[PDB]
Structures are given as structure tokens and as C-alpha cells.
């Protein structure tokens, strides 16, 4: 069949978010609050195109928005954030319930200096709506032409011509 069409290595180069999973988990709720729109454009493009090769520009916008998010954290509230993700990072399961005072420090400094509000319980799990400008994929499964079905039955059901026609049975 056809040759698979991959993007080049220069199409995949982007400045990475080189932070740990506890760093990402510490500012996860503010990341969901502040980086909503390009992330949801990307995940809508990802569930509609069903192809990661059709989602590279949206992923690059995701990475750019995440980098601007952590640069906006680092300029204003770097030390309460470091105090908070170190305490998140200590735990094996990385509990949020173990670190509520460092969370209160980080959320206080973030609300005072950056105006960000941490979302309530239930908000990040909402199904939102996304205003895209790309067209809707007309055939994302690349489904070919379907086979035409067998013809249905029609007409009034007349009696059997001369019965069963079973050798001599006249009915």
C-alpha cells in the first residue's frame, strides 16, 4: 500500500517543558485555569482529526502557552512555588492533602500578584465548547465507499402458484 507520510525532524522541534511531574502537578489547577483555550483547541483537534500529524501546530501552541505559564510563575512567585512543589515531590503518591499550607501560600501569592483563581471542585472536569477555525473532518476514518445493500421486498403477498409444488401435493 501507500508510503506513510511522517513529518520531518524540524517539524517536531519545539522548546520543551523540562520540569518534573511534581512541578506539573503543583501548578496543575492554575495550568487548567489559565491555559484552557489552546489546550482545548488541541484536544478537540486530537479527538477530531484522529491523527497526531494533523495536530502539530496545536501541540506547539500548547507548548508555547505552557512555557509562558511557567515563565509567568517564575518571575513573580518562584519561591512559594518551589516550597510547594518540593513538599508535593516528597510524597510517593504525591498527595495534595499533605501540603495544604504550602498550597495556601502559593495560591495566596498567585492571587495577590497574578490574579489567578484556583478552580473549584468540579470545574476542570467540565465539558467545554471550543471555537475553532479549521474545517470539520469529513472522513477521519478514511472510510471508502460502502457496499450497496441487498434489495428489500415489496409488493402484496400473493398466494403460492398451485400450492407447494412438491411432486404431487396440489396444495
Amino acid at each position: 500500500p501507500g508510503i506513510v507520510e511522517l513529518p520531518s525532524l524540524e517539524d517536531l522541534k519545539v522548546q520543551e517543558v523540562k520540569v518534573s511531574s511534581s512541578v506539573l502537578k503543583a501548578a496543575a489547577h492554575h495550568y487548567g485555569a489559565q491555559c484552557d483555550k489552546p489546550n482545548k483547541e488541541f484536544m478537540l483537534c486530537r479527538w477530531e482529526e484522529k491523527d497526531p500529524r494533523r495536530c502539530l501546530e496545536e501541540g506547539k501552541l500548547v507548548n508555547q502557552c505552557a512555557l509562558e505559564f511557567f515563565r509567568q510563575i517564575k518571575r513573580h512567585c518562584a519561591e512559594p512555588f518551589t516550597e510547594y512543589w518540593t513538599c508535593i515531590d516528597y510524597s510517593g503518591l504525591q498527595l495534595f492533602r499533605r501540603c495544604r499550607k504550602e498550597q495556601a501560600q502559593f495560591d495566596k501569592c498567585v492571587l495577590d500578584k497574578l490574579g489567578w483563581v484556583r478552580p473549584d471542585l468540579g470545574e476542570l472536569s467540565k465539558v467545554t465548547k471550543v471555537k475553532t477555525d479549521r474545517p470539520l473532518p469529513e472522513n477521519p476514518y478514511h472510510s471508502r465507499a460502502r457496499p450497496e445493500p441487498n434489495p428489500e421486498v415489496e409488493g402484496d403477498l400473493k398466494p403460492a402458484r398451485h400450492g407447494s409444488r412438491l411432486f404431487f401435493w396440489t396444495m
Binding site: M43, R46, K50, N150
Partner: protein
Amino acid sequence: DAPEKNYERTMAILQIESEKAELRLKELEVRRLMRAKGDGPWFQYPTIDKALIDHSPKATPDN
């Protein structure tokens, strides 16, 4: 019986039996073509209902 009655009743018998014989020949030919091609109402062995397919957005997008 009259020769008229026997003669014309014989003709009616011959009509009905020749009609049934040509219908049996067509019965064999229709059965042969529907087993061979499979495009009639007979020999429609079941495939999977596509009403059983879930079309919801799943957990992973590549599907």
C-alpha cells in the same frame, strides 16, 4: 364422460402441471444464482449488526 369433458379437463391438467414444472425449473435456477452470488433475500447469513458499535469519544483519541 364426454370426449369434450375429458379432452378439455386433460388440457387443464396439462396446463397446471406444465406451469408447476417451469416454476420448479425457475426455483432451481433462482436457488443456484442466490447461493452463487448471494444478492437475493435467501442465503443471507448474518453479519455483525453495526447498531452495536459505540461511537462515543473514548479515552484515547487514536481510534
